Amino acid sequence: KRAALIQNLRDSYTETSSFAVIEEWAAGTLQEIEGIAKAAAEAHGVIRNSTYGRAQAEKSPEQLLGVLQRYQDLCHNVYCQAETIRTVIAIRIPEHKEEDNLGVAVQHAVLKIIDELEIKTLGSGEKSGSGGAPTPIGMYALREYLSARSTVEDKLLGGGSQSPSLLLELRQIDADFMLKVELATTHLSTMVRAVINAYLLNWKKLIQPRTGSDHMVS
Amino acid sequence: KRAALIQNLRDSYTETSSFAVIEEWAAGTLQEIEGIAKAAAEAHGVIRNSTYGRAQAEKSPEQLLGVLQRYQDLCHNVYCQAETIRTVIAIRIPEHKEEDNLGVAVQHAVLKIIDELEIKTLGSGEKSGSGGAPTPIGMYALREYLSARSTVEDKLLGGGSQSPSLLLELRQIDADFMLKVELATTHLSTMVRAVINAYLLNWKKLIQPRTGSDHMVS
Amino acid sequence: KRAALIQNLRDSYTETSSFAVIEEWAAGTLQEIEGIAKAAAEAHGVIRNSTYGRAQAEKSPEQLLGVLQRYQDLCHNVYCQAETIRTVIAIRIPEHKEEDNLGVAVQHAVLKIIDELEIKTLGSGEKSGSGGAPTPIGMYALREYLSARSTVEDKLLGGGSQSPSLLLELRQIDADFMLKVELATTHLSTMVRAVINAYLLNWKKLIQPRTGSDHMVS
Amino acid sequence: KRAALIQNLRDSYTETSSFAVIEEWAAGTLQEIEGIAKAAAEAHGVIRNSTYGRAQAEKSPEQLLGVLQRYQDLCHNVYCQAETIRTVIAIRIPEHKEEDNLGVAVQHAVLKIIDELEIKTLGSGEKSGSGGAPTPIGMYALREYLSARSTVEDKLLGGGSQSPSLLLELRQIDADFMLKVELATTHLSTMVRAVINAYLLNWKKLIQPRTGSDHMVS
Amino acid sequence: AYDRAITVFSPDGRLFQVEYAREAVKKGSTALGMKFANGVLLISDKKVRSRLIEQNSIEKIQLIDDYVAAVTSGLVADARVLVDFARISAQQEKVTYGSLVNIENLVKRVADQMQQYTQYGGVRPYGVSLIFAGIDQIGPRLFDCDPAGTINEYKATAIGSGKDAVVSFLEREYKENLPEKEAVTLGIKALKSSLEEGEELKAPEIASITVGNKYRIYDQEEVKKFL
Amino acid sequence: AYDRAITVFSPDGRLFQVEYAREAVKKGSTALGMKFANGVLLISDKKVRSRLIEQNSIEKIQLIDDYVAAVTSGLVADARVLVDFARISAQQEKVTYGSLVNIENLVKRVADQMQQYTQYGGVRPYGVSLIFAGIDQIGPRLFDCDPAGTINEYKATAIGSGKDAVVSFLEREYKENLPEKEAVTLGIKALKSSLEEGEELKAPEIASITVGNKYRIYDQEEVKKFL
Amino acid sequence: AYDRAITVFSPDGRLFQVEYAREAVKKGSTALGMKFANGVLLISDKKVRSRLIEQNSIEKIQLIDDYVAAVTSGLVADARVLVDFARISAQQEKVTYGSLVNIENLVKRVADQMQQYTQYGGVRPYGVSLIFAGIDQIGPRLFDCDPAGTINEYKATAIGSGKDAVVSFLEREYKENLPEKEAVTLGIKALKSSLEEGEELKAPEIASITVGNKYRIYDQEEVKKFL
Amino acid sequence: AYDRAITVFSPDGRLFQVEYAREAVKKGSTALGMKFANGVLLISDKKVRSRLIEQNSIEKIQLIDDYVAAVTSGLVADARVLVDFARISAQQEKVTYGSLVNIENLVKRVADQMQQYTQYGGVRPYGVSLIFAGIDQIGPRLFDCDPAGTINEYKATAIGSGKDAVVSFLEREYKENLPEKEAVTLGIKALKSSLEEGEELKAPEIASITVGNKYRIYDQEEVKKFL
Amino acid sequence: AYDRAITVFSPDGRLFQVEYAREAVKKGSTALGMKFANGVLLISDKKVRSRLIEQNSIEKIQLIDDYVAAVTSGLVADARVLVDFARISAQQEKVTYGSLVNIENLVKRVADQMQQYTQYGGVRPYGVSLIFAGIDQIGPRLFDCDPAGTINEYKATAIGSGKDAVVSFLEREYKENLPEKEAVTLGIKALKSSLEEGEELKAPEIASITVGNKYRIYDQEEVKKFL
């Protein structure tokens, strides 16, 4: 039974599933994000006040790793929560037609901002489109940091490099990565706030995009 | 004879073939994806609770290799199943006209979501387009895991790299590939659910995109 | 309660938040920019009047690093302030409709200029689009300068390379990075001035994009 | 007060500021360009009537650097003068409407010619668009020249290369960079000339895009 | 796109706007007619929507005169306008000639009015199909008429959403010259077969006419016997 | 594509312009009607706003004649024009026959005027719904009529923003043949159920008629007794 | 972009809307006419198709007067209107002059009416072809007429889906001056050749007329003798 | 998409062209009316341009007859046409019945003319609001009328650019049954409150009428005493 | 999007087609009028072409009757039509009442004709402004009239390309009750100040009228005396 298959999907991902995500985002998520932004500003201040030597190439800074980890964990949760809302909407896109698509237009408009949250803001894909990657840093922040820093560490440790700018670069990778987190959390907050508004204003047509019954006919 | 050739095509791949895929996706497939998602989270948890030394560069972790193999088998099965549904629709695109294209636009809209599933979600192509690769990980995730881990292993093993971030990176590659599986399974479930709803809502025009006798003429 | 969630969002980020950014930009921000422009013009004079030996490859010029640092700090603040404005407008984009969208078009037009500021002018993203990077220098100018200088320092220090142009290139990296900050501060000024004007001409529709009269109805 | 913030902007950058630029461009600027064109032409003749050995790989030619230097300084001035005009126009783009936009279309068309000047003609952006870099040489020509010759220098000097064509290429880099300055000065002259015409034909609508000669109403 | 204006033919020679009008007709309540021994009847299902609705009213079955009745499906206000047209047109014939000799000419006048609204810009078609049933100087008559102004004469037929289920039932179960009570029974059964999965017939409208008589409209407790 | 002109059917057989006209009607103030023992009544809500307004004119309830009244919702100027049409049409019938036997025919004349504005290009539908209530030779009558010219006859019904609340309430609470006082009480209660909560009812218009009499409009005082 | 309006010529001087109306004509049931010794006949393929349909009325062959008949292919309601126009136009000539001397002039008035509908904005062409056949002062006559208003006089011809086959068969096999019975046989044969392989011709309509007589319609049994 | 033609409803049931016509009205000069003890008055502002203009041909308050005056705001030429319509329409009533019993019927005829221009393709709405003020058999009357043909009766009201300010002031400051001198004083204060930074207001037009009397236009020197 | 049809309001309530018609007016030759002691005059800048043009033949100043003259700017053919209209409309008023008491009514009839052309689709506005000057039973009069049918009465005014210069000049120089000769001088002075780059005023047209006389057109010779 085809209707039962559809009804099973919709009963397991209801308006309550996507609403619960929006409630979670309005409260705890925005506050966690702000927390990470402060942690990164704090860690950033410490790096600016530091003279680097060779010893800084022999150890990876645990404070920066902790911030990056926190950011990655948050991005993970938000991505998974974003997919709940996409599911709720996507299993309610109605029969394809060339008419009565005003509520369908709402569905696609909100799906598109969520995709932007996931794809552009969170940088969750393996490869960015030709529109590039507009977020200061993405989901795989730790990997990106470790990869950039190891390269410079190797050159410095070797005889290691004589280059004065290369040692300064080790520090700049540390500083810029904390800065990128500050910028990305700020940017992600805007996006999370835009989605909350877009959901709550449009939710009825998200669930019920067509309002049927023939009043002109019998 | 041409009508016999068309009849042979269409009898070979009918609404029953594509319906059977949909039934399978709504039950066994989603469960299997959920199973992989769990195994990936478990593996990720084990890595996050790990300190890595140079011994981790000497064995490739069998548990992660197995989560990735399991993800790939699943992607494989979904791609081939998506191809059945696609055959069923494509062999029923009717004579090209500039009219009577309402059911044909349903056919193209469903085909384009299957294309998205196959090309974007499953990352099945050998080269991604100008729109990047939006899925957290694709069909050849195991090779991309081994390729990434291997470059690092070689650097760390013979005298190895003394880069501390390089050692943390090996751990990050392990953790991230598990993360990517968790994200890719959630994203894949959304896409599968979306296709199930779209198919079941539109299946009649997918099979018979033009209907009716010509009652106006005698 | 949904209206309370919307209201809590909109109370947190009001016309006052965005007006304050704009007031700051029209005064303190533009003054700081001219300041940075003058410091770079000065550092560029000194470099022009200098002959370079391998001793210049032995030390990273502190005066250049300070100009680049100052430019980054400024870009960082402008970015964060631009996002306050984006937030204010984005949480007020109204229910999606196919009508009564004149103010909504004002909201999208101003968000677009702000995106250009953030993305093109400030080069805040990890990756430029196929459209390129049309600002003379971006947010991570300091890391950009350090990498480029670092490469040439390595080649000169080794035995060191005996290329005469390589030696001139070291001076040219120092001069160009100063030139780029002069060009970029001029460019950013124009954009900050464009947005001040755009904001203050349009703020009313940015806040209340629909004005929904009484009516011809009862 | 908002009107005051706008008036201050507009009083600091008036039609006089942009007119002064166009007067400068019509005279001093076009003559400076022609001088650079001649200097480059003569420097090209010198290189054309030359046999190269590794003596010419041991010194970087001061005549070429000077011509390239003089080109950069000129590009620098044009860019900053172009920013003046953009400021004058952009701070006069009026309230966003779906009507009364004939002068607004003038503003955008002249802004676009100025951008092409700045972005394409001067090559001032750090990375060019997918459209490419159609100018013969850009703003950072010296750096460009030094890196190119410098590479060939290190190959020739060493354990240096036995390749006869690599020696001729050192010569060709010198010749070609002078030729690029001859072509680029010419291309730049056309563009400066097109902007002088465009500005003087359109300045009234650039300053006053809407003329509120009202009437019809009570 | 060839489907936006009534006066535009598609490359295949179709009038899509007219085809769309006949979609409106597919949404109405099911009705049927059938000829029996020396007569014809009509039955109509009514989509009852609430106990606050006065049910004696706005009937699906409308007498055109004492010997001719119609039932409509589709746009309700369009259908009311066509029933008014049919009534006045019936009276004009009767005044002109003293009687209405052949019901087919009445149906053709109605269908001609409908054909007009598919040929001239600035109008839309009527979103209506009708069945006409009655007795003329030829005998018992049953016709239908669609938005294009296409007409056919039948032994049995149906219109509205259940049309396809009703017609297939009648195709295999219909027999000519049934006594009235057996025609009605079959008719009721035909209607019941169009209802979805454990639904129930809520007393339809029934009307019949036999040779030498005027139309009779079955009352509530008369229709009740058949359910 | 299909929703820009009344003369254009969509592929599913819909007239989107007529459906958009129905959206104007939903923004109007709630009004209801109901039949009671030997009579019928109307109640109209009014969100009256400013104290600078004269509350005692531009009424929601309009007498058509001494035995028939209407209440409208939707575009106010359209409604006025339809009410003017109904008054003149009533009088035309009275002059012709000497009386108005059946209010249903007056309602059909108004609804036919509305139907025609859904079929001819160069014109928009009326953005109006009306309820008609009165007494004729059949008894107390209650009808509604929408922008498409679709009519129904009712025991009770509502129009305007609170239509659905009012109607669901009456579905469970309405009884036939209540005395006038109990009918008004139920009506008043039905209207309050449609309110926003914390939001109160500031003295509706109320009118009624019983067999043998002409309409009475309840004065400002007599309405309060029910609040 | 030159095919949306009847008043728009293409750069090659074509009227695509008129060509699209022809397309409608090709979808109808095949009919044919032929001249034989002192007469002319028409045969029509009857695509009957359902036992619930009356196999007696809405025929393909329509008498215009006692001496002139037509058969049509394409839009049915359009065709009925053109037949009504033709019948009225025949009577107008007969009242004016006492008789109808040359059938070509009747066909021209019908064709002029069609032509007018290919020249003025706000109307679509008729989606109809006709064959006319009869006897006038000149003798037996056979004409065709298309949506453009183009006419030709023939010895034999056809319209409908099987036009092309039927005409091929006749261009090979047709002979002038056959006695009636051999002309009919040739026509039946001609019509069988048009059917999709292994599909049986049910009884067509057949009508003929000879100099000095009125038309006769062949009854259901007399046709069978040729099947 | 939905805001280009007067005959097109938006999906929310709005008529955007009519809403845009109401924007033309917001640009006109501010005028107000208010009822007082046994009377009603109108006050019009207006920006005089040059000193080269002739005052007195200044044209804001227009007598419709001896008992009725209007002020308008919006497109001036549209407003002149509606004022001529009102004058001729008042005389037609006066000739028909010998007098104008109820000013409300005059305002309705004008509003009906403006309504029609929101319903027929080929025409734009009048971009005008009017206030009508006078005495009839009911007493002193004050009405406004907008581009949609929507009318309200008021104790006090205003139109034009300063409408909102003026309405707000009167909302807080208006009292019924003031002597004429106090009414004019309050009116002048309400008008002044609507001006910006430093304007002070040059001499506006003022007109009043009391029961038993005809209109008086305060002349330049009388108005000065209130400034 | 909103500037292509005269029947379309832009979202701000503007009629861009009417505004574009003004633009044609601005391209015309400057003309002015001014009231002096017991009088009124008009002056028109001619504007040249070759020595091959018959000078004194297509005058910019046009007599409407012996007491009323007009001058126009903008589309010349439109202007001629409006002058022919004004001439016939004056004679109609003279036949009806015996005389033309108040010139403002003539200007209103002309302005109402122009207003109609901004309200009905299928029509473009007149691309014309006019100044009317004459004497009536009220005294010397001066009016202007624009494409919208907007009118103003003046002491002095101008139209055409040099309008703003001329008006600016008059706004400081203009004196109320000047003698004819000095009024004319001020006029030429004002006209000259609108020419740019030491441009030479060749002989303009002049006309004047004083109470109790008919119009006089200055000869080419009499104008020179002022040049």
From Swiss-Prot, chains E, F, G, H, I:
Regulation: The formation of the proteasomal ATPase PAN-20S proteasome complex, via the docking of the C-termini of PAN into the intersubunit pockets in the alpha-rings, triggers opening of the gate for substrate entry. Interconversion between the open-gate and close-gate conformations leads to a dynamic regulation of the 20S proteasome proteolysis activity.
Impact reported for K60A: Prevents PAN to associate with the proteasome and stimulate gate opening
Sorted UniProt keywords: Cytoplasm, Proteasome
SUPFAM superfamilies in the cross-refs: N-terminal nucleophile aminohydrolases (Ntn hydrolases)
A Gene Ontology term for the protein's cellular component: cytoplasm
Keyword Metal-binding belongs to the record: no
Post-translational modification note: The N-terminus is blocked.
GO molecular function, a single term: endopeptidase activity
SMART domains documented for this protein: Proteasome_A_N (SM00948)
Compartments, record wording: Cytoplasm
Biological processes, Gene Ontology terms: proteasomal protein catabolic process; ubiquitin-dependent protein catabolic process
Recorded superkingdom: Archaea
Record bears the keyword 4Fe-4S: no
InterPro entries: Ntn_hydrolases_N (IPR029055), Proteasome_alpha (IPR050115), Proteasome_alpha-type (IPR023332), Proteasome_asu_arc (IPR019982), Proteasome_asu_N (IPR000426), Proteasome_sua/b (IPR001353)
Listed Gene3D superfamilies: Glutamine Phosphoribosylpyrophosphate, subunit 1, domain 1
Note in the entry: The configuration of the closed gate contains an opening large enough to allow rapid entry of tetrapeptides but able to impede the entry of proteins and longer peptides.
Biological role stated in the UniProt entry: Component of the proteasome core, a large protease complex with broad specificity involved in protein degradation. The T.acidophilum proteasome is able to cleave oligopeptides after Tyr, Leu, Phe, and to a lesser extent after Glu and Arg. Thus, displays chymotrypsin-like activity and low level of caspase-like and trypsin-like activities.
Family listed: Belongs to the peptidase T1A family.
Subunit structure: The 20S proteasome core is composed of 14 alpha and 14 beta subunits that assemble into four stacked heptameric rings, resulting in a barrel-shaped structure. The two inner rings, each composed of seven catalytic beta subunits, are sandwiched by two outer rings, each composed of seven alpha subunits. The catalytic chamber with the active sites is on the inside of the barrel. Has a gated structure, the ends of the cylinder being occluded by the N-termini of the alpha-subunits. Is capped at one or both ends by the proteasome regulatory ATPase, PAN.
Name of protein: Proteasome subunit alpha
Species of origin: Thermoplasma acidophilum (strain ATCC 25905 / DSM 1728 / JCM 9062 / NBRC 15155 / AMRC-C165)
Organism classification: Archaea, Methanobacteriati, Thermoplasmatota, Thermoplasmata, Thermoplasmatales
Gene assigned in the entry: psmA
